[PDB]
Amino acid sequence: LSTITTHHLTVPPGLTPEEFQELSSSIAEFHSYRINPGQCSSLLAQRIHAPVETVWTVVRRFDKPQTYKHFIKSCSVGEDFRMTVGSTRDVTVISGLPAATSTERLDILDDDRHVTGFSIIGGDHRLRNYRSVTTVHGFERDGEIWTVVLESYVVDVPEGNTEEDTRLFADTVVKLNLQKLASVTETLAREAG
Amino acid sequence: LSTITTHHLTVPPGLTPEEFQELSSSIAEFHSYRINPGQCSSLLAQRIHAPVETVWTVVRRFDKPQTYKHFIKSCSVGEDFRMTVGSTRDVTVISGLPAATSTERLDILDDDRHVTGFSIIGGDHRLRNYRSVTTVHGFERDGEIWTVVLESYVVDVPEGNTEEDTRLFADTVVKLNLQKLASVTETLAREAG
Ligand SMILES: CC1=CC(=O)CC(C)(C)[C@@]1(O)/C=C/C(C)=C\C(=O)O
Ligand SMILES: CC1=CC(=O)CC(C)(C)[C@@]1(O)/C=C/C(C)=C\C(=O)O
């Protein structure tokens, strides 16, 4: 029947084992899900050579996904938008023609622990039951500093598609956006200001 | 009625004016098209800190688009594939679910001038009449060497879509793949071998 994910029990690509062992409790706490037979889930990681708060300042901007995500034509939150759990955004995504619309809900926002997450709750695309969580972590070794971002999701496998294609699609989207996040924040860190 | 494109008469993003003035004859020769009212066309550029042949070795691999393009699940050319004008490839693209299929024809392959191009001639997506050309150019200044890649396309604007969304879609795809090309070839150049 239902199962618990195992992301917190194996090393995700692009993470070292030493890094994983430092993150294993966070992965258990924030990146575990109970999933049903029609669902899949994945955990992706991205190392970033920038301080945590530099990365978090970008990651946390629910109303400006275009700043670290590809193919965002627009994102609207409506005036009086205040960043609070339950707020929603309408994203127009130009990954194809016509452009897709995704309505997304802010699920988590913890500025102290550097955790956020959202759920897709409308739109005209095929990803159903999509929910993701992103956490940001600082590392240090001999005075050197870096960040690891972890992003996991759960989603329904769409009718007529395999889990492997579903995971390949969502994994590729998340991985490429994490690479943009790394570039944007490493540029920020390099240039200071 | 029909018009000639003007890419060879203005500076595309990410190119310096000095670079453009060196490339203007190539842009006129390889990146100009006669287009009809229902069509749009764009020219994109990418500077790469690697020698021309390092970039060209990758650009020229019609059967391995996955090496510098995002979201390629597979590409099949069939046994006895020989790289000749008229050869075709079946690309499966995982930019959405279900994955798209594009059947593409090799239009140009000039290893001396570093020119290639392809036309989409089948599949189950919406891009109709898509044709692109890619050229690769070497620059030198005071012993320093770099490459510029130019990629242009012509495509039909799909029913119910604006030219601006059509250009935004194709421009973003091409720009992001040119960035992967730059990363892949700059890594190659940095590591030599
Ligand atoms: C890029 C794209 C293409 C689709 O077909 C679905 C949807 C529009 C939701 C999406 O924005 C997917 C976004 C995902 C998976 C994650 C994110 O944004 O963190
Ligand atoms: C990424 C993608 C999404 C689509 O919806 C159309 C198609 C499948 C053709 C495509 O491969 C487009 C590829 C383009 C424009 C250029 C290329 O490859 O040089």
Numbering used by the authors:
A (entry chain D000), B (entry chain D000): 28 to 220
Sentences reproduced from the published study:
To investigate the relevance of this amino acid on the receptor function, we generated a mutated version of SlPYL1 harboring a Glu 151 to Asp substitution (SlPYL1 E151D) at the latch and studied its biochemical properties and compared them with those of the native protein. The overall structures of the apo and ABA bound forms of SlPYL1 E151D are nearly identical to that of WT protein with the differences confined to the area of the mutated residue. The Root Mean Squared Deviation for 191 Calpha atoms are of 0.33A and 0.20A for the apo and ABA bound forms, respectively. In addition, the ABA bound structure shows that Asp 151 carboxylate is hydrogen bonded to the NH of Thr 128 at the C-terminal end of the gate loop. This hydrogen bond is not present in the native structure and might account for the increased stability of the mutant protein in complex with ABA with respect to that observed for the native protein. In addition, the analysis of the ABA bound structures of SlPYL1 E151D and SlPYL1 showed that Glu 151 replacement to Asp leads to the formation of an additional hydrogen bond linking Asp 151 at the latch and Thr 110 at the gate. This would explain our data showing that the ABA bound form of SlPYL1 E151D displays increased stability as compared with that of SlPYL1. Interestingly, there is a reduction of the RMSD as a result of ABA binding, that indicates that hormone binding stabilizes the entire gate loop despite it does not make any direct contact with ABA. However, the degree of such stabilization is higher in the mutant protein. The complex nature of the denaturation profiles obtained without or at low concentrations of ABA hinders the calculation of Ti, however, SlPYL1 E151D protein displays larger Ti than the WT in the presence of 4 mM ABA, showing that the Asp side chain is involved in the stabilization of the protein.
